[PDB]
Each structure stands twice: as C-alpha cells, then as structure tokens.
Design brief:
Assembly: monomeric
Entry title: solution structure of the analogue retro-inverso mgregriggc in contact with the monoclonal antibody MAB 4X11, NMR, 7 structures
Keywords: pseudomimetic, synthetic peptide, retro-inverso analogue, TR-NOE, antigen- antibody complex, DNA binding protein
Shape: elongated
Number of helices: 0
Largest sheet: none
PDB class: dna binding protein
Strand content: under 5%
Number of strands: 0
Name: histone H3
Length: 8
C-alpha cells in the first residue's frame, strides 16, 4: 500500500 498507507 504505497510504503504503509494507514487509511484509504
């Protein structure tokens, strides 16, 4: 998810 991405 783009290097992490914790919400959308």
């Amino acid at each position: 998810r783009x290097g992490x991405x914790g919400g959308c």
